Structure formats: structure tokens, C-alpha cells
Amino acid sequence: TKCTLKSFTVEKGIYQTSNFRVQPTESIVRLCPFGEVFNATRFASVYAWNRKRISNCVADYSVLYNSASFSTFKCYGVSPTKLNDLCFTNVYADSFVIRGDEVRQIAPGQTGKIADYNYKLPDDFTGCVIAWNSNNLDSYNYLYRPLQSYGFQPTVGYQPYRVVVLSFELLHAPATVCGPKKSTNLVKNKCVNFNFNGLTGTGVLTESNKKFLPFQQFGRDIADTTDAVRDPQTLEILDITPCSFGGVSVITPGTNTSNQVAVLYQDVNCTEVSNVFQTRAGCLIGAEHVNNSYECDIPIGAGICAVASQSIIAYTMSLGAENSVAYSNNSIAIPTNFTISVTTEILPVSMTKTSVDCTMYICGDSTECSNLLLQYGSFCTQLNRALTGIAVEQDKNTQEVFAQVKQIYKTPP
Amino acid sequence: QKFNGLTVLPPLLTDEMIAQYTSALLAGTITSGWTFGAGAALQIPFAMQMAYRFNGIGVTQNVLYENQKLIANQFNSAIGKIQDSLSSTASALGKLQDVVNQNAQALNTLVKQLSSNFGAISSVLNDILSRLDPPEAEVQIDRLITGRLQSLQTYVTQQLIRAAEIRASANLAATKMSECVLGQSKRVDFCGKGYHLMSFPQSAPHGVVFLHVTYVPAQEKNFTTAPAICHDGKAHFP
Amino acid sequence: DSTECSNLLLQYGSFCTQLNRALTGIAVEQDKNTQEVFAQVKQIYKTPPIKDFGGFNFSQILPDPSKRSFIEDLLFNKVTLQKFNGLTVLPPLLTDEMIAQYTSALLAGTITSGWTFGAGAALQIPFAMQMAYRFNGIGVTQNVLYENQKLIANQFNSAIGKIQDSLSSTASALGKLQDVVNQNAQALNTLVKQLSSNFGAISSVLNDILSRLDPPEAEVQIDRLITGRLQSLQTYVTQQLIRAAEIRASANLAATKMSECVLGQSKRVD
Amino acid sequence: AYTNSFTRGVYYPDKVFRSSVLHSTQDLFLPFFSNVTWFHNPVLPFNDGVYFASTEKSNIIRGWIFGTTLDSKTQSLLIVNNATNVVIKVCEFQFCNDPFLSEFRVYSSANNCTFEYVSQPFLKNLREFVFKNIDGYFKIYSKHTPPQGFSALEPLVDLPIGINITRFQTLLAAYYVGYLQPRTFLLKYNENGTITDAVDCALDPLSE
Ligand SMILES: *[C@@H]1O[C@H](CO)[C@@H](O[C@@H]2O[C@H](CO)[C@@H](O)[C@H](O)[C@H]2NC(C)=O)[C@H](O)[C@H]1NC(C)=O
Ligand SMILES: *[C@@H]1O[C@H](CO)[C@@H](O[C@@H]2O[C@H](CO)[C@@H](O)[C@H](O)[C@H]2NC(C)=O)[C@H](O)[C@H]1NC(C)=O
Ligand SMILES: *[C@@H]1O[C@H](CO)[C@@H](O[C@@H]2O[C@H](CO)[C@@H](O)[C@H](O)[C@H]2NC(C)=O)[C@H](O)[C@H]1NC(C)=O
Ligand SMILES: *[C@@H]1O[C@H](CO)[C@@H](O[C@@H]2O[C@H](CO)[C@@H](O)[C@H](O)[C@H]2NC(C)=O)[C@H](O)[C@H]1NC(C)=O
Ligand SMILES: *[C@@H]1O[C@H](CO)[C@@H](O)[C@H](O)[C@H]1NC(C)=O
Ligand SMILES: *[C@@H]1O[C@H](CO)[C@@H](O)[C@H](O)[C@H]1NC(C)=O
Ligand SMILES: *[C@@H]1O[C@H](CO)[C@@H](O)[C@H](O)[C@H]1NC(C)=O
Ligand SMILES: *[C@@H]1O[C@H](CO)[C@@H](O)[C@H](O)[C@H]1NC(C)=O
Ligand SMILES: *[C@@H]1O[C@H](CO)[C@@H](O)[C@H](O)[C@H]1NC(C)=O
Ligand SMILES: *[C@@H]1O[C@H](CO)[C@@H](O)[C@H](O)[C@H]1NC(C)=O
Ligand SMILES: *[C@@H]1O[C@H](CO)[C@@H](O)[C@H](O)[C@H]1NC(C)=O
Ligand SMILES: *[C@@H]1O[C@H](CO)[C@@H](O)[C@H](O)[C@H]1NC(C)=O
């Protein structure tokens, strides 16, 4: 608080220095028939390469990437690992059988009998070019380009290989195929970080009470403030409440009076972060709780105020001495003496007549800068004038309160 | 304070000049009481003026004369307490000190904002301009201007709101002086506690301090009463 | 709770500190408006156990230890008394069942002790004699009260029972109090709604813009949301300062009326 | 042959849940008290979504045909009710002068057909539907009611189709047809989270 006040001596009273919050813990997280592409019984010739458009599914791309079912695995644009985190409009796959040495030709920027007359790729990116050895299950029943057949003999560069080329459609239409959403288990009664399939916020997840209907994923109560959400993968309804947070203030009798300080947390259950005590206003730590009552010294809230006998104390403030005037309808109390007294009452009637130069305040001694200020018109003039209009009436207040005497009387000697 | 396009205007009425009004004021209310604030001043002996002011509350004039010595003693020993209450107790003028602190804080916050970046490459206008061609420089400058303008707009808005609050305070202070200094207030609990008798303004740098002299009962006894008394079949009301 | 957004806040300097302090001053001021109006008595006077105030019925005016006074209970039945993030509410210094102890003290003085209770030492006086003086002050000779006391007490009592029915059976009789509650709620509700505002950005949610954009372009989009939301916050505080000033004026008048009309007998007309 | 759609045509604009609160949103809704055309098998302009209703307890109403040209020239939807399942395709069927629907002679061709989906069947008794195109996502709205009164139309499916639908000649007992317009409404959400009332923000000076 010395810091947030920028002083080495902070005075008596209550000061706010920062906020606090419960940090989120243990975050939680809320199929395309590729078998007929890579595990197909038969593939066609390269000159008549076939293609199928794969769409409308959630596709897990690690199955054919992290295991060695292929001899060639080369992807472009996106590293092969991250395909499971991306959505695409469409996926196309080309399939054919070729010779081994001819595998290097299935790429952009290639030349040869295959690249030029059998299967040509555009000068662009390609999802993944994947190939595997196939002489174990296939090997003159394949043709290449006018056309020629392949002498695939079972007895490496001349062996048959099955090639699948994946091509993705990007942002042409709403995405129809993406990878999986590797959800995790959920927790309860704890502030957590959540990611509810497109919703990333914080709070405490508990079993909800309000009933949804079959076509609601989540709900709100006012201004997009999500209250409860049905989990799409487990089909349960849970409520959201923010994890307790708030302001923290300190109570001091003064820096040169005593370094003893108590900390006040506002609006929380003091189950969690010397002395510990609860109030209607938040729990106090370091202030000893007394029973009897006194005049409010350092206010806290909800009727509780807070040094006495070299320690801090909190108490409910007394309103005043409780006396009961004895009412009688046959008797009256009257003064039989009097005490004349004096009383000081302080009232401000002025402030310092502030005046600020806008063109110097914003730019000052710069012609080029002020050239841009002119594009904001009269802002300075209205602001300059507004300040002039207060400084003018400050002289009036002093004139109005004090100058009420027709002339200047003198005290007789 | 005021060091880069900021200033403070001097007051029209200086401290030595205001202290002449308050000397003129309470040199009247000693010599003439409520009269001088209506028309021509009328010199009235002080004790006579006080005796009337007692009558203005509801205590018979003679009470003051019979106890004139005691009243003067209590009055003086009361004024001396103010001299000493103020001379040692800090935060005596906290209400007055607050306005000064608020003004100072507003000025210091505004000045500090000159070092804010506002998303620019640099917080200082001289450096951005000194190393960027006008095209790119104006873009970086425009961010700075918008920020600084918003900071100034914030200042002037709060200053007007604070000014409005002072105006109400000034109106009250002016009002209190007219009825409590240039006259004798009848409304209760307005010019200090108790039954209002007299008051005097005292100067202050940014405000006005009043010393309110009031009559307060004490040392009271129990008596039996009767709405009226009956004598020869008639009710005698006081 | 966005680290990247925060970096884009420090560049604006003390903006948040200034706004925070402004809302602190009013909140401290609000605790003073209640201390300055209700706390007019240094002691807590109590209604005598036996109640013989010359025939004037006070039972619906004074607290009933069953629960505040009957009328107060009715008042709390005619008014219609949220925060999610960054927003909170502070409790008042003086709670409801604490303020009702100032009123039930200021009201137990004016009845028993006349106007001296809040002038100097309280002076017990029979109520009828107190009323007789009050009639004198208006400019009606004291004896009028005594001769007609039985009629005056009846009119007084039948008049109190009218308000109890006027209040309870006629709604919207506390429009002045409901507006303040309603306007406060409207200010907070509007401020919350602004979080969904786009302000020309790609998207209104900070978590989504950042999650799919590189820091370069992301900051440009983020800067737009911050500028917008910052203005929405400054607007709220500005309105609260102006509104608070009006409440202060009301609170100041309430204190004056209580001092002159409750703690004594005002003579000014209307 | 027009009729009056008193307050029909309200639907749940999103999957949000509300309770005992009045939300005022804006979307393609059927204006209240509008002129609804009561047909008793023409092609109808689509024009930014279409409210559909029918009370005819008959299987004659069997499905629809959404597309641009409704021929082999363009993909089109043969949304049909197969009386055990709802069957949807977007295959490039060719035009049929009058495709009946107990025989079926609508699916004449399937050239470069790209999307097929099936689900549970929809199935005196007034059925209401709303079909809207939005940013390529094709949604479908429905309800089942035993045409005076008020109700709400729940969603069934969103289809990420991305096609141009300008003609929706229903296949073939009467059916109403309306058109949607960008109207702001004040939807009243009950405690149960259902919609129980609505205000048409441009119908009357009062509703304004
Ligand atoms: C006037 O008489 C009443 C009642 O005798 C006094 O009130 C009581 O005074 C006694 C002694 O001070 C207290 O112990 C009681 O608590 C008071 N209340 C009662 C008994 O009702 C009253 O103090 C007398 N007035 C003065 C100032 O002497
Ligand atoms: C009223 O109270 C005042 C309080 O000052 C009394 O004045 C004091 O009286 C005592 C006893 O005679 C003296 O010892 C003091 O010196 C007096 N003080 C002053 C400042 O004069 C006064 O006597 C009281 N009068 C009555 C009638 O009770
Ligand atoms: C003062 O007025 C109250 C008005 O409520 C009286 O309380 C009522 O008395 C009537 C009969 O006279 C009962 O029917 C009500 O039930 C009472 N109200 C209650 C108990 O809340 C009270 O009796 C009056 N007292 C005096 C002394 O006049
Ligand atoms: C003055 O007015 C009061 C009430 O306004 C009258 O008192 C009433 O007396 C009449 C007849 O005696 C009754 O019918 C009313 O019900 C009484 N009202 C109350 C509240 O007591 C009174 O009679 C009038 N005249 C005088 C001379 O006082
Ligand atoms: C092909 O079949 C083998 C053996 O059953 C299996 O390990 C492999 O994963 C299958 N490929 C696909 C794409 O399912
Ligand atoms: C602290 O300093 C202030 C001002 O110098 C003084 O009034 C106060 O009594 C000091 N407190 C102590 C414990 O010395
Ligand atoms: C804190 O929560 C626990 C469990 O819900 C409850 O028993 C306790 O009373 C709460 N504390 C306060 C101050 O409400
Ligand atoms: C405070 O009062 C409570 C009343 O229940 C009592 O239990 C407790 O021991 C008291 N403590 C002190 C220090 O007076
Ligand atoms: C409709 O249902 C029948 C039997 O339930 C089934 O044989 C047929 O394949 C389905 N689909 C049609 C007719 O398009
Ligand atoms: C098939 O039709 C779709 C829809 O218009 C179109 O995008 C695609 O290019 C067509 N492909 C072929 C091979 O006809
Ligand atoms: C719909 O038709 C218009 C005709 O101008 C065309 O420009 C637009 O791209 C078409 N939309 C789709 C999704 O084919
Ligand atoms: C729906 O609301 C009604 C009336 O508020 C209530 O009785 C019922 O329990 C709630 N739940 C449902 C869906 O029945």
C-alpha cells in the first residue's frame, strides 16, 4: 500500500491496493471411411487415376501418421501432426498404382512420363502424398501413359506401390471435415479453465438446477453471461458461477503509529486465502475480534469498524450512549444554569483557477503535430473555454460569500 | 504542478484582501449586530446587543445582565479553547485540505499521462517525429493525439463536476453568513449546535471558517407541572 | 484474466487507477450521506415503557419488537431491490437494522423531550404541553389545544391510519425511491451488455480473436475492443459522478429538513 | 386465395436458454397478421426463407424440392418423408413434370450427387415448418400442433449445404406458405425456457 499510494507514510484508515482471484486449476475439455481409401482391395491405373471426395465427418489423422503402415509419408502446408486440430471444407483423395522410382514424381514441380501424361499436380500445396509398398498383395494389370503397362514382378524401384494423394478444400464453403476434439474428464466445485467446444471461460462448474430443452447447448441470463451448459459429449447439464474474486484492502493506524496491519478481503467465504474472522463484508485477517462496542474509528462495512492496546481490533460500532429519558405526564425538566460555547464549521468556497493550453498540452512547439490537431476542430476551444468558465466563477464564489458588506467597518480602538 | 502548457491563475481577491472583509464583517456584528446587514449601521453597546440575542431565543433579557460576568468568562474561555483545539489537533481542516489535495491529484495525474505510450512506438512526440517520415509518423502521432485528447477530456469533465460541488458549498457558505453572521438564525441545528446567538467568519486559503456562539442549557432539575390552574372556577393559562 | 490484453492496458497509463478512484470517492461519499442525515443524536433515546402521550396514538410510528416500526416494514415491501465479472457492490456502513435505530431514537426524542433533545440535554416534558407550545409557535394561543385536546388527538390518529392505507393500498407512492434503484440497475445492466459489443472488431469475444490470429494482427483487433470498452467504462463512471452529485443534493436537503423540522419546529412556509 | 397468419411463425432463433426474461432479437421472421397464401403443386419463389404450414392429415404432402434450377443443371435437395424415416439428398436430380409421392418417380437422376442424410420421421392436426438459408448453412424449423393461436417452432437439423435455393416446389390436401422478413421481435421466454409470447416491433404503433 505504500507503493500503490506512492508514499513512505500512509495515514490511518482503510486503503484498497489490489484485487485477487482464485486461479483456475485442472482445466477440462468439452468418422470418414478412410478404410475404403487406404485398405481398398484394388487400385486403378495411373493414366486413369480415380478420386473420391471425402466429407461430412470428424476425421482422426493420427491413425495413418503415427504408425508405420506406409513407406512414404510426405505432407505439405501443415505439419502432419496438426491435421487433427484443423477443419476443412472438403477432402479429395486420388488413388493409383505406379512403379517405385516413379513415386518421387507425385509432387508439384516435377517432370517425366508420369508427371506430364499420367497424373499432374498443380503448382500449389497438397495435403499429404502417402505411398506404401504393394508387391506383397498386387504383383501387367496396370497401365501408364500412347499407354504402356508395368512389368511389376514379385522377384524395389520396379515394384508396385499404391499411392493416395489427399487434397483439402479451404474456406470455399462451411467446413465439413475436421479432426477430433480429444475431450478430457470434467470436475466439479472448483474454479477451472474450461473450453466447451467453442466456449473458453472460467468459473466453478457444479451440477445445475435449471432445466434445458432438447435443442439448447448452453444458456445465458443477461448480456451473453453464460449460466449453464449441457456437455455435448457426456450429455449432462452443469451450472457456471464465477470463482470468488474481489478487492483486498488493509487497515492501518498510520505508518508512524504502528506497522501493525490487517487485511480485508471483500465478499468471499473465508474458507481459503495469523488471525481469522468473518464479517458480513468479507473476512478479516490480523484483526482481533472483540465483543463490546465503541465509536466507529476505521469503517469496514455492515456496521463493523476497526488500534487499542498495541493491536488491531474489529468491532460492531455503538451508535451512542443508551439513555431513556423518564417520561412523566405530570412533570417537566428545566435548566437551572447555562453553558455558552463556540463551534467551528469549515466550508470551502474556491479552488485553484486551473487553465491549460491544449495546443501545447497535446503537441507543443511542433507545427506538424498541430496540423493534425486541426482535424479535431474545436475540442481545445471547448475544453479551454470550459476551464475558463469555472475559473471565472471561482472568483464569484469568494465575491459572493465574503463581499456582502456595503463598506469596510473599523473596530474602535 | 504546472510545467508544460499548464498554469494556475491567481485569485482576484488576495489573502490579505479577503482578511479585510472578515475584519470588516465581524467588526460590524460586534458593534451593530443584525442591523448593519439591512441598512445603515447602528452602534449598540455590546452587552445590550447580547441581551437582545438572548431574548431572540426565548430567555428573559434580565438573565444576561444578572449573569453578565459569568457569560463573558465562559465566552472567553471558550474562544481560547478554539485557539488550542486547532493549534495541536491535526486534521483540524481536513474538509478544507481535501479540496487542495483533489486539485493537486488531478493535475499530477494529467501530467503523468504524457509518458503513456497509447500504443505508439514512443511516448515522446519529439522522438517519433525525429525518426519517421511524415507518412508513417502521422499514423503514430494520431494514436498519441487521440490518447492525450481523451486524457484532457477526462480532466475537464471531472473538473466541472468538482466545480459544481464547490458551487453548492459556496452557496451554502454564503447563505450561512447572511443569516448567522449578519443576523441571528432561528432555524435549529444550522449554525453549529444549540441555540444560535452569534457567529463570526474567519478566513482560510480556499474556504471560510465560522465560529458559532450558541446558548446551551445545562444543570436541569425535575419539576411537577400542570397544563393550567383553576381559581374561582376559571382555568388560568400561562 | 488475459495477459496479452493487459500488456495493451499499461500503454494507456493510469486510466484504470483514475476510474477506480472515482468510484471509490462516491462510495465513501455515500456512506457519509447516511451518516450526515440520520446521525443527528449522540445518544439512543428509548420510548418510555408506559405510553401515555396525552392520547396521541404512536404505536404504528414506533418500532414493534415482534420483528423496525410498522410503517417502515411497509416501506420495505414497496421497493424492488447484478454483477458477474469485474463488477461488485459494497455493503453500506450502516445496515438497515442499524439505521432504524437512529430513526427510532430521533422519533423517541421528539415525542418525549420536545425539541431540546437535539438542542442540548434532553428535557422530559408531557406531550400535551409540548404540543401546546408548538401551537403557540404557529400563532395559535396555547389554550386552544387543551380545550380541544380530545378532538386534536382523534384527528391525529385518524390521519396516521390514512397514510398506512395510502402507502399500502396505493402502489407507486414511492416513485422517488424506485427510480434510484431502477437507474442504478440500468447503469450496471447497460455496462454489462457492452461486453458483447464488437466496436468494429473481427469478434466481440477477446478469447476468440486472439485464439486464431497471430499477435501482430491480433493486437490491432484487441486494441479496438479495449478502446471501446474503456470508453464504455468511463461513460459509466461519468454518469455515476453526476448522479451521485444529485443524490448528494437530495441528501443535503434531507439533513436540513430533519434538523429543522424534526429536531425543532420550522417556521418557514411550505 | 389469401388468409391471415395472426401471430404464427415464431421460432427459437438460437440454441440459447433464457428464463422469465424478455429478449429482443432480430431475424427473418414471418410478419404478424400477414397475407398467407392458402394453396389447395406449383413452383414458388423462395426469397430469403419460407414459412410453411399444413393441416391436411394425408400422406399426399410427402416432401419438397429445393434448388436453383431443379434439374440436372444444378444440385438440388429432394427432402422427402419416407414414412419410416426422413430422407434427404442433394444429388442432381432431373426435373419431373409431376412427381407423385403408392409409387415414387421423383429421383430421375443422381449425377455427381454429393450429400445424403437420414433421420427419424417427422409425421385436426396442424404442422408448421420454417426453412431458412443463412451463410451457406441451411436450417430447418418445425413443430407439431393438433390457424388461430400462438406457439413456437423448434429446430430439427442444420445442414451445411452452401447451395443457392430459389425454388421449392412441394411434392404431391392444403398447405399455407409465407415469406420471412428481417423483423425485430421481443421474444418472451417463460420460466421453463420456452417462448410463450412475442411482440412484432413494426406491426403497430403500440408494438413499436
Ligand atoms: C427526574 O426523575 C426521574 C425519575 O425519578 C429520574 O430518572 C431516573 O433517575 C435515576 C437516578 O439518576 C436513574 O437511576 C433512573 O434510571 C432514571 N430513570 C427512571 C428511574 O425512570 C431523572 O434522572 C430525574 N432527573 C434528574 C436530572 O434528576
Ligand atoms: C453555572 O455553571 C457555572 C460553570 O462555570 C458556574 O460558575 C462557576 O461556579 C463555581 C461555584 O460558584 C465557581 O467555583 C466557578 O469559578 C464558576 N465558574 C465560572 C467560569 O464563573 C455557576 O456558578 C453555575 N451557576 C449556577 C446557578 O449553578
Ligand atoms: C394505537 O393504534 C393501533 C393501531 O394499529 C392500535 O392497535 C390496534 O387496536 C385495534 C383495536 O383498537 C385492534 O383491532 C388492532 O388489532 C390493533 N393493532 C395492532 C395490535 O397492531 C392500538 O390499540 C392503539 N393504542 C392506543 C393506546 O390507542
Ligand atoms: C370542527 O371539526 C371537527 C372535526 O373536523 C368536529 O368534530 C367532530 O364532531 C362532529 C359532531 O360533533 C362529529 O360528527 C365528527 O365525527 C367529529 N369528528 C372528529 C374527528 O372528532 C367539530 O364538531 C367541528 N366543530 C367544532 C366547534 O369543533
Ligand atoms: C487396414 O487394416 C489393418 C489390419 O486390419 C489395420 O491395422 C489398419 O489400421 C487398417 N487401415 C485403416 C485405414 O483402417
Ligand atoms: C505520526 O505523525 C503525525 C504527524 O507528524 C502525528 O500527528 C502523530 O501523532 C504521529 N504518531 C505517532 C505515534 O508518533
Ligand atoms: C462457506 O461455505 C460453507 C459450505 O457451503 C458454509 O457452511 C459456510 O457457512 C460458508 N461461510 C459463510 C461465511 O457463508
Ligand atoms: C464474546 O461473546 C460470546 C457470546 O456468545 C462468547 O461466547 C465469547 O466467549 C465472548 N468472548 C469474549 C472475549 O468476550
Ligand atoms: C424407405 O423405407 C423403406 C422401408 O422402410 C426402405 O425400403 C427404403 O429404402 C427407404 N428409402 C427410400 C424409399 O428412399
Ligand atoms: C459436383 O457438384 C458440386 C456442387 O455444385 C461441385 O462443387 C463439384 O465441383 C462437382 N464435381 C463434379 C466432378 O461434377
Ligand atoms: C447464387 O447465384 C448468384 C447469381 O448471381 C451467384 O453469383 C452466387 O455465387 C450463387 N451462390 C452460390 C452459393 O452458388
Ligand atoms: C415450468 O414452469 C411451470 C410454471 O412456472 C412449473 O410449474 C414447472 O415445474 C416448470 N417445469 C416444467 C417444464 O414443467
Q: Is C52 within 8 Å of chain A by CB?
A: yes
Q: Do C13 and B190 touch (CB under 8 A)?
A: no
A260/A223 same-domain check: no
Calculate the alpha carbon distances from C98 to A232, A303, A304, C33 in Å: 51, 7, 11, 15
d(CA A216, CA D19): 13
According to the entry, how was the structure determined? Answer: cryo-EM
Task: Give the chain A residue nearest D160 (alpha carbons).
Answer: A174
How many degrees, rounded to 5, is the angle at CA D140 between CA D138 and CA D144? Answer: 175
* Closest C-alpha to B148, from C82, C267, A360: A360
Q: Is the CB of B230 under 6 A from ligand 6?
A: no
A172/A215 same-domain check: no
Give the Å distance between the CA of C156 and the centre of ligand 4. Answer: 13
A72/A160 same-domain check: yes
A78/A205 same-domain check: no
Length of chain C: 270
Q: Do A219 and D192 touch (CB under 8 A)?
A: no
Indicate which residue's Cα is closest to atom 4 of ligand 11.
D164
Length of chain A: 413
Q: Is B40 within 8 Å of chain C by CB?
A: no
d(CA A366, CA B4): 13
Closest-CA distance, B118 to chain C, in angstroms, reads 5
* Closest C-alpha to C27, from C111, C71, C88, C82: C88
Nearest CB among D115, D137, D193 relative to A213 is that of D193
Strand locations in chain B (E): 6-9, 195-202, 207-224, 229-231, 234-236
What CATH number has the domain bearing residue D50?
A: 2.60.120.960
**Coil/strand/helix, residue D117:** strand
- Using alpha carbons only, how large is chain B's radius of gyration in Å? 29
d(CA A372, CA B137): 11
Chain B residues within an 8 Å CB radius of A361: 4-6, 148, 152
A154/A58 same-domain check: yes
Q: How many CB pairs under 8 A join A and B?
A: 269
How many degrees, rounded to 5, is the angle at CA B138 between CA B134 and CA B144? Answer: 145
**Chains in contact with D, where contact requires at least 3 CB pairs less than 8 Å apart:** A
Residue B177, C-alpha cell as written in the block = 453568513
d(CA C112, CA A334): 14
Calculate the alpha carbon distances from A339 to B77, B220, C71 in Å: 11, 12, 39
d(CA C92, CA B43): 53
Closest-CA distance, B236 to chain C, in angstroms, reads 9
Q: Do A224 and C44 touch (CB under 8 A)?
A: no
Instruction: Say which amino acid occupies A116.
Output: D
Give the Å distance between the CA of C157 and the centre of ligand 4. Answer: 14
Strand locations in chain D (E): 2-5, 21-29, 34-39, 50-54, 66-67, 76-77, 80-81, 86-89, 116-119, 126-134, 137-145, 154-159, 175-177, 181-189, 195-200
d(CA C88, CA D206): 37
d(CA A395, CA B13): 7
Q: Please name the helix (run of DSSP H) or strand (run of DSSP E) that holds residue C190, with its range, or none.
A: helix C175-193
Range of the domain at B49: 1-217
Chains C and B touch (3+ CB pairs under 8 A): yes
- Residue A85: DSSP 8-state: G
A283/A193 same-domain check: no
How many degrees, rounded to 5, is the angle at CA A388 between CA A384 and CA A390? Answer: 125
Give the Å distance between the CA of A282 and the centre of ligand 7. Answer: 12
Which residues touch B40 (CB under 8 Å, ≥6 apart)? none
Range of the domain at A209: 23-30+181-243
Nearest CB among B8, B141, B171 relative to A353 is that of B8
B208 backbone dihedrals φ, ψ, rounded to 5°: -130, 135
**Coil/strand/helix, residue B26:** helix
Range of the domain at D201: 2-208
Q: Is the CB of B222 under 6 A from ligand 1?
A: yes
Instruction: Say which amino acid occupies C267.
Output: K
The number of C-alpha atoms within 13 Å of C74 and in the hemisphere containing its C-beta is 19
Residue C27, C-alpha cell as written in the block = 462510495
Indicate which residue's Cα is closest to atom 20 of ligand 1.
A326
A75/A174 same-domain check: yes
Q: Do B222 and A333 touch (CB under 8 A)?
A: yes
Q: Quick one: three-class SS letters along B63-101?
A: HHHHCHHHHHHHHHHHHHHHHHHHHHCCCCCHHHHHHHH
A77/A141 same-domain check: yes
Neighbours of B136 (CB within 10 A): 12
Which 130-189 residues of chain C touch chain A by CB within 8 A? 189
**Coil/strand/helix, residue B45:** coil
Under 8 Å between Cβ of A95 and A162? yes
Chain A residues within an 8 Å CB radius of C127: 329
Q: Do C143 and B154 touch (CB under 8 A)?
A: no
d(CA B24, CA C255): 32
d(CA A366, CA B130): 11
A176/A193 same-domain check: no
Nearest CB among C1, C43, C101 relative to A321 is that of C43
Q: Is C200 within 8 Å of chain A by CB?
A: no
Q: Is the CB of A217 under 6 A from ligand 6?
A: no
A248, A324, A332, A347: best to mutate for the C interface, most C CBs within 10 A? A324
Chain A residues within an 8 Å CB radius of B221: 333-334, 336
The total domain count for chain D is 1
Under 8 Å between Cβ of C11 and B117? yes
Q: Give the pairing type, strands A177-178 and A57-58.
A: parallel
Q: Do C245 and B118 touch (CB under 8 A)?
A: no
Give the Å distance between the CA of A146 and the centre of ligand 10. Answer: 30
Indicate which residue's Cα is closest to atom 2 of ligand 11.
D164
Residue C252, C-alpha cell as written in the block = 443535503
d(CA D142, CA D152): 9
User: CA torsion, points B189, B195, B201, B202, in degrees to nearest 10?
Assistant: -90
Under 8 Å between Cβ of D34 and D181? no
Place of cell 411537577: B224
The number of C-alpha atoms within 13 Å of C188 and in the hemisphere containing its C-beta is 15
Nearest CB among C128, C252, C259 relative to B189 is that of C259
Calculate the alpha carbon distances from D179 to C80, D25, D143, D176 in Å: 43, 19, 18, 11
A41/A164 same-domain check: yes
Indicate which residue's Cα is closest to atom 3 of ligand 5.
A39
Residue D105 Cα to chain centre, angstroms = 23
Under 8 Å between Cβ of D131 and D52? yes
Under 8 Å between Cβ of C26 and C230? no
**Coil/strand/helix, residue D77:** strand
Question: Where does ligand 7 bind, in terms of residues with CB under 6 Å?
Answer: A 269, 271, 278
Chain C residues within an 8 Å CB radius of A319: 39, 44, 98, 101-102, 105
Q: Is the CB of C265 under 6 A from ligand 3?
A: no
d(CA C221, CA B72): 77
Resolution of this deposited model, Å: 3.5
